[PDB]
């Protein structure tokens, strides 16, 4: 039931999902000094997904 | 008289809101999304039924 640029565009959990979201800090490994670009996201679309 | 007087209050309560955001469902469900819109749907379907 949350909207968003990542919920609607990357990735949307259905209205009747079920099952636990798991989520952690990542800084250590997926920051550098230089910068992770590799890492991509999606902000513009025609429909909603 | 009284059959009449039934059907009307019948279509009265139509008009009626049952603490939901407004009667017409059709309001609710371009206001309100989906997850939210479902509960006040429960509240006039409840009420009609």
């Given amino acids: 039931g949350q909207t968003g640029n990542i919920a609607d565009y990357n990735y949307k959990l259905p209205d009747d999902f079920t099952g636990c979201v798991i989520a952690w800090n990542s800084n250590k490994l997926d920051s550098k000094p230089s910068g992770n670009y590799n890492y991509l996201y999606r902000l513009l679309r025609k429909s909603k997904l | ?49």
Avoid: Y
Wanted: aromatic residues 2%; glycine residues 4%.
């Fill in chain 2, 1 to 49: 008289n009284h059959n009449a007087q039934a059907l009307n209050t019948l279509v009265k309560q139509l008009s009626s809101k049952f603490g939901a955001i407004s009667s017409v469902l059709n309001d609710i469900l371009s206001r309100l999304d989906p997850p939210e819109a479902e509960v006040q749907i429960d509240r006039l379907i409840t009420g009609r039924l």
